[PDB]
Design a protein around this ligand. Structure first.
Ligand code: HEM
Ligand code: HEM
Ligand SMILES: *[C@@H]1O[C@H](CO)[C@@H](O)[C@H](O)[C@H]1NC(C)=O
Ligand SMILES: *[C@@H]1O[C@H](CO)[C@@H](O)[C@H](O)[C@H]1NC(C)=O
Ligand SMILES: *[C@@H]1O[C@H](CO)[C@@H](O)[C@H](O)[C@H]1NC(C)=O
Ligand SMILES: *[C@@H]1O[C@H](CO)[C@@H](O)[C@H](O)[C@H]1NC(C)=O
Ligand SMILES: CC1=CC(=O)CC(C)(C)C1
Ligand SMILES: [Mg+2]
Ligand SMILES: [Mg+2]
Lengths: 240, 240
């Protein structure tokens, strides 16, 4: 079918567009998406997500078209466009800072420490660990960011993203909702598929039916509460 | 090179997809967009809006990508998809009914009578008339629709739509914010470019700089006030 030896990892160059998403960045770093990270359409994301991760079109079409809002182009984005705050990009990221008090675009090792330290005693991250991380990340934003946005919508996106790293970077069936720390850490830290370390694309399709109960369970265990107005309104386009 | 004589009006057939937008319906009825009203992308809308109306890519890209959310496809819609309540489609339409209490899709003459009767004594609709109509239409939804939604966002979209019919169906410079009743009525009632009646595509580009002050003025004269939730959250995709 598809050859991963034909999709080598290469570090992004100075003019390669990268965004706040390790999922799409990794695909770009492997040429599943254009290495320059530009002129990326939803069909390209669908194909790239399938080929790279076995993530199905249901979630990628839905998230894809929302992400398209971040650009000024008709049907494409640069990966960096996705940093636009309040479309998808949200406070209390796993590996980026809140835009009001820092860089919401680039990987940040200090931020990532909370996740990297989660689930002490196991060699995997799992649903309970992901939930604790989300709780701790949100508490941090509430403590240090007086403009924190925390809504039903941001909470759901956050849980989705956790479900993604648990499933896409899994060793076993993605259903189990657990992934080796060695895989997940390479994914975030280097935005690389950890092939060397033993990772293989899931042979189980990762789609909304599979992700949905993982997402809800992460949310449930995270002891989440809304902030302020709880308005789930998205930013519809740049420079508004 | 655009030839309007090569773009005759034809009535939609029973299986030609039509939506709640007279702008896009008219383009389809003239073959500027596919006559079947299916498989329509943002680039196609951009080109069709330029060719047909001299509406620029700035507004069509922004509106277009929001409209894309209404389908289950990667990068296209049917025109009917746009009826999805709470993405763009809203209560207090000029020519459709509120979805909670009627058909939010098709032209309705009874609804349209408020607009058709506006600006008594002149042969044009203008900013003040458009504002009065919006005020009256919203009062109608507040009176008769127990599920009425009225937000900053819906109010602004409504004013945008009014600005569109004032500008795209204009005889003079679209800047003036006035259009012959004969043109606007055919546009809504038949979803036809009133070529026979003397209408010609604007030679002035219709873009956000031009529309913005018209929109704000319509809003201002309309004596609009928030009435409830006022959360400008859009529906992000169908069947949620
Ligand atoms: C298999 C597909 C994907 C995976 C595995 C994935 C993975 C991730 C993960 C783990 C995060 C969290 C990063 C963090 O909190 O620091 C994230 C964030 C993000 N992803 Fe994705 N993603 C995928 C697809 C997409 C798509 C298709 C889009 C856009 C359409 C997207 C847009 C984003 C954005 C904007 C963020 C930033 C959220 C934030 O932290 O503020 N992702 N992604
Ligand atoms: C760029 C893509 C466009 C999209 C996605 C779009 C979408 C929509 C939608 C979904 C509605 C229904 C809102 C409602 O009344 O509840 C609507 C209404 C309308 N659109 Fe468009 N439209 C677009 C372009 C245009 C253009 C170029 C015109 C030019 C005349 C136009 C004129 C209107 C008007 C007058 C209405 C109001 C109909 C009413 O209140 O009864 N639109 N549009
Ligand atoms: C996650 O792993 C830890 C340690 O192995 C364990 O205490 C916890 O029950 C696990 N939770 C889930 C959901 O598997
Ligand atoms: C839609 O259009 C694309 C490109 O114009 C074409 O490849 C495809 O066959 C079309 N599909 C439909 C829905 O007819
Ligand atoms: C609209 O037309 C009416 C009647 O001709 C007139 O009284 C009013 O000044 C006009 N409004 C605008 C904004 O031009
Ligand atoms: C509409 O409003 C009524 C209250 O008058 C309520 O019973 C009903 O749930 C609402 N319908 C929708 C669509 O939520
Ligand atoms: C201002 C405005 C006008 C529209 O018609 C669409 C959208 C996206 C709501 C933006
Ligand atoms: Mg973030
Ligand atoms: Mg409506």
């Amino acid at each position: 079918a598809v050859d991963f030896s034909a999709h080598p990892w290469k570090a992004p160059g100075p003019n390669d567009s990268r965004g706040p998403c390790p999922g799409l960045n990794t695909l770009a770093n492997h040429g599943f998406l254009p290495r320059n990270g530009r002129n990326i359409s939803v069909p390209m994301i669908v194909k790239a997500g399938f080929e790279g991760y076995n993530v199905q079109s249901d979630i990628l079409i839905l998230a894809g078209k929302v992400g398209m809002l971040t650009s000024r182009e008709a049907d494409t984005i640069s990966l960096e466009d996705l940093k636009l705050h309040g479309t998808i990009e949200h406070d209390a990221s796993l590996s980026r800072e809140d835009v009001a008090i820092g860089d919401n675009l680039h990987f940040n090792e200090a931020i990532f420490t909370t996740l990297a330290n989660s689930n002490p005693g196991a060699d995997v991250y799992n649903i309970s660990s992901a939930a604790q991380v989300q709780h701790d990340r949100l508490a941090d934003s509430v403590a240090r960011n007086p403009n924190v946005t925390n809504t039903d919508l941001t909470a759901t996106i956050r849980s989705s993203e956790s479900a993604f790293y648990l499933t896409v970077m899994s060793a076993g069936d993605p259903l189990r909702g657990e992934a080796p720390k060695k895989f997940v850490n390479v994914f975030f830290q280097e935005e690389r598929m950890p092939i060397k370390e033993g990772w293989k694309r899931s042979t189980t399709p990762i789609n909304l039916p599979l992700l949905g109960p993982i997402i809800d369970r992460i949310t449930e265990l995270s002891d989440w509460k809304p902030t302020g107005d709880n308005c789930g309104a998205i930013v519809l386009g740049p420079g508004l």
